[PDB]
Structure 1
Amino acid sequence: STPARRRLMRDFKRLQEDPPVGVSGAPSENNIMQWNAVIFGPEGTPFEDGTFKLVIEFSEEYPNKPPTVRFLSKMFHPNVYADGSICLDILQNRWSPTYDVSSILTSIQSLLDEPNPNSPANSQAAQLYQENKREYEKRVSAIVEQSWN
């Protein structure tokens, strides 16, 4: 094995033993470096009832280097690109090996209801979030419904 692979097995064991509310994930069948994950939208937010699928991509440099994470489900959120790529500060400059898959996934769930206003990846979503909360929620509701497909 390798340190990344042993760490990933530890991350999985910890996540499966004590999963945070509305989050789960596991390595793919055939490749511990690629995981499938699910995040349920947080209760009381525009994303409630959404069941969102994600892919997490690691390397042999984990946990020195953060993974990348993308939504496979359709998304509408200021910090998610059109291709599903998720922008999260802890996956960039605020990375620490103290974070693991569990805490990455919980951060992404929390991100859903707490957009980062700094240079958002989806300008349309950012502008609606800022200036037309009412309409932001309709656009979010459409991708909540699609997430059940």
Structure 2
Amino acid sequence: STPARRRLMRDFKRMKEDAPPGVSASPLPDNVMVWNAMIIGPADTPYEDGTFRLLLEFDEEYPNKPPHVKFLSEMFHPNVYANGEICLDILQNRWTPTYDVASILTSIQSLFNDPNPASPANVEAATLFKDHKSQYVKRVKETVEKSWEDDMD
């Protein structure tokens, strides 16, 4: 046990009891440095009800240094790259030691309700969102279903 690991244990208590709406996460029973998480596609978005899973990997510099966060589920969002990585200042240059798993998950959750990034990670998704919003939704619906098939395996 170390400062980082204990902090992570505290982040876990908060998720066990006061877990924010639509977000859930938990460390492996044997390794607190690796966590699995899931964000339910928010309300009135084409992402609605999708079970999007992520992988968070921490180190001993936490919470001074953020964890590596990436989506394991196939995604179609202007802020999410092809390898599942996310473009979000909170996770990069704007990170603060006050953040925790909960806040990380909520901040990412919020992106679903605002596909308006300045500089997109997924350019195809950004363009389609502006030009052919009908197709964007069709594509987003496709990933929502795909997230459901994953669980069935």
In the superposition, the TM-score normalised over structure 2's length comes to: 0.93
Q: 1:88-136 CA deviation, whole Å, 9 max, x = no partner? A: 1100111011110001001111112213422211110011122222211
Q: Which amino acid aligns with 2:126?
A: A
Q: Distance in 2 between matches of 1:15 and 1:65?
A: 20
What percent of counterpart residues are identical?
A: 69
Structure 1 residues not aligned, in runs of 5+: none
Q: Distance in 1 between matches of 2:89 and 2:114?
A: 12
Q: Distance in 1 between matches of 2:126 and 2:133?
A: 10
CA contact (8 A) 1:56 1:68 kept: yes
- What secondary structure, in the 3-state scheme, does the structure 1 residue paired with 2:148 have? coil
Q: Which amino acid aligns with 1:131?
A: D
Over aligned residues, Cα RMSD in angstroms? Answer: 1.0
Q: How does 1:18-37 map to 2 (within 5 A)?
A: 18-37=18-37
CA contact (8 A) 1:74 1:84 kept: yes
In the superposition, the TM-score normalised over structure 1's length comes to: 0.96
Number of aligned pairs?
A: 149
1:60 aligns with 2:63: no
1:144 corresponds to: 144
1:44 corresponds to: 44
2:3 corresponds to: 3
Structure 2 residues not aligned, in runs of 5+: none
C-alpha displacement of 1:49? 1.4
